[PDB]
Design an enzyme around this catalytic site. Structure first.
Site, PDB file in Angstrom:
ATOM      1  N   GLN A 182       0.791  -1.229   0.000  1.00  0.00           N
ATOM      2  CA  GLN A 182       0.000   0.000   0.000  1.00  0.00           C
ATOM      3  C   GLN A 182       0.827   1.285   0.000  1.00  0.00           C
ATOM      4  O   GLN A 182       0.314   2.319  -0.419  1.00  0.00           O
ATOM      5  CB  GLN A 182      -1.016   0.020   1.153  1.00  0.00           C
ATOM      6  N   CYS A 222      -5.406   0.174   3.344  1.00  0.00           N
ATOM      7  CA  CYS A 222      -5.567  -1.200   3.859  1.00  0.00           C
ATOM      8  C   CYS A 222      -6.988  -1.739   3.648  1.00  0.00           C
ATOM      9  O   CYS A 222      -7.141  -2.889   3.287  1.00  0.00           O
ATOM     10  CB  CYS A 222      -5.170  -1.270   5.330  1.00  0.00           C
ATOM     11  N   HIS A 244      -7.007  -1.206  11.379  1.00  0.00           N
ATOM     12  CA  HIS A 244      -6.366  -1.672  10.161  1.00  0.00           C
ATOM     13  C   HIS A 244      -7.098  -2.866   9.574  1.00  0.00           C
ATOM     14  O   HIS A 244      -7.370  -3.838  10.270  1.00  0.00           O
ATOM     15  CB  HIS A 244      -4.882  -2.014  10.497  1.00  0.00           C
ATOM     16  N   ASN A 268      -1.553  -9.417   4.821  1.00  0.00           N
ATOM     17  CA  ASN A 268      -1.443  -7.975   5.007  1.00  0.00           C
ATOM     18  C   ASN A 268      -1.182  -7.288   3.669  1.00  0.00           C
ATOM     19  O   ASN A 268      -0.987  -7.981   2.678  1.00  0.00           O
ATOM     20  CB  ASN A 268      -0.399  -7.655   6.068  1.00  0.00           C
TER      21      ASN A 268
HETATM   22  C1  LIG Z   1      -5.325   1.289   6.647  1.00  0.00           C
HETATM   23  N1  LIG Z   1      -4.196   1.446   6.040  1.00  0.00           N
HETATM   24  C2  LIG Z   1      -5.841   2.454   7.375  1.00  0.00           C
HETATM   25  N2  LIG Z   1      -6.927   2.086   8.282  1.00  0.00           N
HETATM   26  C3  LIG Z   1      -8.229   2.170   7.917  1.00  0.00           C
HETATM   27  O1  LIG Z   1      -8.565   2.498   6.782  1.00  0.00           O
HETATM   28  C4  LIG Z   1      -9.251   1.781   8.960  1.00  0.00           C
HETATM   29  C5  LIG Z   1      -9.954   0.470   8.605  1.00  0.00           C
HETATM   30  N3  LIG Z   1     -11.068   0.455   9.566  1.00  0.00           N
HETATM   31  S1  LIG Z   1     -11.135  -0.602  10.849  1.00  0.00           S
HETATM   32  O2  LIG Z   1     -10.572   0.122  11.925  1.00  0.00           O
HETATM   33  O3  LIG Z   1     -10.594  -1.840  10.401  1.00  0.00           O
HETATM   34  C6  LIG Z   1     -12.869  -0.801  11.196  1.00  0.00           C
HETATM   35  C7  LIG Z   1     -13.393  -0.160  12.305  1.00  0.00           C
HETATM   36  C8  LIG Z   1     -14.742  -0.281  12.614  1.00  0.00           C
HETATM   37  C9  LIG Z   1     -15.610  -0.990  11.808  1.00  0.00           C
HETATM   38  C10 LIG Z   1     -15.112  -1.617  10.682  1.00  0.00           C
HETATM   39  C11 LIG Z   1     -13.759  -1.517  10.379  1.00  0.00           C
HETATM   40 CL1  LIG Z   1     -13.265  -2.292   8.925  1.00  0.00          CL
HETATM   41  C12 LIG Z   1     -11.544   1.853   9.691  1.00  0.00           C
HETATM   42  C13 LIG Z   1     -10.477   2.733   8.992  1.00  0.00           C
HETATM   43  C14 LIG Z   1     -10.221   4.055   9.694  1.00  0.00           C
HETATM   44  O4  LIG Z   1      -9.241   4.155  10.417  1.00  0.00           O
HETATM   45  N4  LIG Z   1     -11.025   5.148   9.484  1.00  0.00           N
HETATM   46  C15 LIG Z   1     -10.743   6.416  10.203  1.00  0.00           C
HETATM   47  C16 LIG Z   1     -10.789   7.578   9.202  1.00  0.00           C
HETATM   48  O5  LIG Z   1     -12.030   7.509   8.494  1.00  0.00           O
HETATM   49  C17 LIG Z   1     -12.271   6.340   7.703  1.00  0.00           C
HETATM   50  C18 LIG Z   1     -12.245   5.115   8.632  1.00  0.00           C
END
Ligand SMILES: *C(=N)CNC(=O)[C@@H]1CN(S(=O)(=O)c2ccccc2Cl)C[C@H]1C(=O)N1CCOCC1
Length: 218
Positions: free
Chosen positions: A19, A25, A165, A185
């Site tokens: 990535q 991710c 993540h 990953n």
């Molecule tokens: C990856 N490189 C960066 N992380 C994200 O994109 C995370 C992915 N999710 S999560 O924390 O896995 C999750 C939380 C709650 C329900 C479902 C999931 Cl998949 C969320 C995302 C994240 O950090 N954000 C914060 C900023 O706004 C978009 C969502």
């Protein structure tokens, strides 16, 4: 259910992606789960476009924020709504927020619905991985033992249920008497064990791995 599952054996997993600087991710996890279903249905193993999700699902309707992060369930909702997604070959990965250039003439896959598994249920995640295919999950991947993992079963007591993540569960098993989830990953081949990590399974929803699980259906 079998004791050991690994979808790489059935050729349902693409090459590990990198990535880079872009917080995509969630897009790699989503495409990973759809690639799994695409192979099981059509026999085609194709790397789908995480860039298509990064550029085109960045709206108020979805709550995805491109390189700023997003959700696997919402990436699946975008594919259902759009009527498709392009392959990575026609829509390559840039690791940047770009203007949407989706072309249905290069659509490589579709999605009719997504299934959400029960919060914190490791037994339901095990059944889905065994009988449906690879599953998109959220994990707390913020600790140095995760970043610097190289072998064995990752079982860090500093891990929390506060997920941050998106990853892909491609299997499970037991290594040296410790049940694990086989996790793909998106930090390139030089992360972990050739891009993979074995994470503690049946150990009280370790890293919140069973908290936010989903998989698409074509
Ligand atoms: C990856 N490189 C960066 N992380 C994200 O994109 C995370 C992915 N999710 S999560 O924390 O896995 C999750 C939380 C709650 C329900 C479902 C999931 Cl998949 C969320 C995302 C994240 O950090 N954000 C914060 C900023 O706004 C978009 C969502």
């Amino acid at each position: 259910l079998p004791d050991t599952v690994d979808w790489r054996e059935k050729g349902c997993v693409t090459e590990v992606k990198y990535q880079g600087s872009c917080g995509a991710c969630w897009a790699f996890s989503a495409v990973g789960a759809l690639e799994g279903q695409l192979k099981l249905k059509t026999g085609k193993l194709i790397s789908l476009s995480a860039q298509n999700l990064v550029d085109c699902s960045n709206e108020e309707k979805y709550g995805n924020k491109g390189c700023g992060g997003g959700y696997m369930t919402e990436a699946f909702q975008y594919i259902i709504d759009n009527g498709g997604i392009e392959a990575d070959a026609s829509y390559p990965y840039k690791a940047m927020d770009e203007k949407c250039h989706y072309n249905s003439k290069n659509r490589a896959a579709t999605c009719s619905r997504y299934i959400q598994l029960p919060f914190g249920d490791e037994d339901a995640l095990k059944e889905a991985v065994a009988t449906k295919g690879p599953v998109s999950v959220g994990i707390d991947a913020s600790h140095s033992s995760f970043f610097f993992y190289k072998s064995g079963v990752y079982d860090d007591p500093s891990c929390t249920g506060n997920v941050n993540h998106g990853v892909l569960v491609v299997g499970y098993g037991t290594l040296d008497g410790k049940d694990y989830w086989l996790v793909k990953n998106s930090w390139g081949l030089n992360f972990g064990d050739q891009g993979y990590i074995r994470m503690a399974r049946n150990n009280k929803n370790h890293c919140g791995i069973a908290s936010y699980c989903s998989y698409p259906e074509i």
